[PDB]
Amino acid sequence: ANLWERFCNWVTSTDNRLYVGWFGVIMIPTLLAATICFVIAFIAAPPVDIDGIREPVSGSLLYGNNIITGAVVPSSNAIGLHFYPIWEAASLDEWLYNGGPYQLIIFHFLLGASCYMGRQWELSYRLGMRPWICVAYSAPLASAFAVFLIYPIGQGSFSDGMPLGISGTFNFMIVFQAEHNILMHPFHQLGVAGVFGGALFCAMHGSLVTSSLIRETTETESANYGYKFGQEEETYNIVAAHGYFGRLIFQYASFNNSRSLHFFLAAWPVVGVWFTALGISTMAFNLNGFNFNHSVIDAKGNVINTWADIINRANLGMEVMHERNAHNFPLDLA
Amino acid sequence: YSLGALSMMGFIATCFVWFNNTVYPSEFYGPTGPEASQAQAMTFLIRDQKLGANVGSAQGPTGLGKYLMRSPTGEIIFGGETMRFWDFRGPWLEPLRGPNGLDLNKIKNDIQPWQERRAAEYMTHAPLGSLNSVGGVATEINSVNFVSPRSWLATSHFVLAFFFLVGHLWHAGRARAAAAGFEKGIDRESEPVLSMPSLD
Amino acid sequence: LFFQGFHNWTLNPFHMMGVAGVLGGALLCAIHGATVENTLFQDGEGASTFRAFNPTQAEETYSMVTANRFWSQIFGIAFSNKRWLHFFMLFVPVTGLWMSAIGVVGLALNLRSYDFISQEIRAAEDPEFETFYTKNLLLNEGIRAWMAPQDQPHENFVFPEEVLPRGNAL
Amino acid sequence: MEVNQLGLIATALFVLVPSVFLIILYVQTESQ
């Protein structure tokens, strides 16, 4: 047909080695920009005054970091939530000093990843698949939005978003516990059940299907060669896996519908990680973990400490040391 | 389509109640997070100034002013961590504002007791508290039974807006699937991929 | 939190591997469940797809071929072998927990990955050198001193206010 | 940075030895 139709047909071709799609049209440029900036900043970016106090943190390999300590440092607290594109700086040197690469990377990345999710829907439509893989991915995506966007919004500064580094991640987690007692928050406890249980059910399903592979190979070749790609039939005996697992526990604590079983594997980690993403997102608005400090007292009124009071002494150690030069007034209200 | 709309609206609601002190008056809802944080700097400026401190020339430990510093576009603003919140505007604070930001002469002369009261009230009703309604930072002891209406409303509506985006994706994807006729699964007899060339 | 403040356990590569295995297992759990549920063949005529499966059927209930193409074009590579995929699901989390166990055996002996000597040499000499690694240690130091007296009461740790490490104001 | 200069040779062999092992097994597979 005409030119715009050739193009539309290419963009949405199910024959490209990698599907592009209309979401891909936004995803590709934004991820490329985020990736190139992140790689260059991680190696070469100079120190960044993250907390706005003219106390720059070195995050890059060339300025004395290794893989574990290096990071792209969040933008300055002096900036708060202001948009700080390159063109708003008077010079690249000013932009690097105040942590601009961080804004550029995370905005392009949230955009790119939001479109990655749409792309998963889009291709499943072109293939005639059911559409809800993208729903599963919403759990990890939601989590990234929380640490990179929502938490900075509630607290009023990208300087408190998560750093883009291994040790920077730890910094963010320790400060968080100090300020929100996240360990004592049920949404985070739901996140741990999500991922623990996901790991468990992951090992279980794999162990249980592997346990009931049909002998289709000899002892000298990999069992795996007993499965041929696209084969009409199944290569394990689900009835035997139920027979094993039903007896391991009891007959009805075990799944015998392959569809019910796989739906469960999808829902358990996704739901739990939804909750822990919502946990960061609501602690962003300072609705914090349970507070049981001095909750037990005796007939006279002495405080009888519990394990919650012992946690609180660790929290206090984090509180009083973190960003040690950044507070002038006794309360750390954001 | 409506779950879409509603989700976007819930997120906007969430930021309205968190930042806006006009249609969510702090008289009724408590102070915003920015507002409480600004209020604390005011409180201790006031106190130290009464003791005889010159708050405009007080260099804090970092070399930045202890009470007052410049925003990145040069406005005079409160110092310390609250430097992030200098965009805050509220009726108790705007009278100290001049053309270049906070005005040191108005700070030295014109602060009334009603501002010291509001600033002290708002600093001690900052929207921080625990799920079981212990008010304050997470290391605070039990005593104060308080969680800001602003926290309650913003958290509830973030959660609600989020799940409604999920509903949007669920029902939009399904609607598309159902309109094309493969919401119930793939047709073994005409499996679309089997009619496509291999990627390699 | 003890393990953070005294062992710097987050910095330990054996824990790092265990984290990868547990979060990777959760990932595998979710993506395999979702992939199967969204590549089902239409085997009944109802909208609830659960009723269209007989545990005694011979046939795969979902399409490995369409699943494979989807992920090849979304993510670049895909599984092609059902046995490898379910063996990988066993391996990843089981191997992660094993690696974490090794590191705790190390910590039984205080054989920690606590420090990076090269950063400490630089930092001790250069008061302008600061990284997220030094920031985290300052937090560790706060945890140990503020929590030890009550946490290890049998030591009768007495720390006057004036020795407690604290940043400005807080 | 005052790093361990034996780290370079440790890292290099950490990589080369097992990688070579794999390459050798793979190539002789493709040739039968």
Partner: peptide
């Protein structure tokens, strides 16, 4: 030398991605 070592390893992985996607053993329906 340490910076060079980290960057070299990271660059080999990126090349590994390229070959693993575009020069994979093609999945065929046997």
């Amino acid at each position: 030398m340490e910076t060079i070592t980290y960057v070299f390893i990271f660059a080999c992985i990126i090349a590994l991605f390229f070959f693993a996607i575009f020069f994979r053993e093609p999945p065929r329906i046997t």
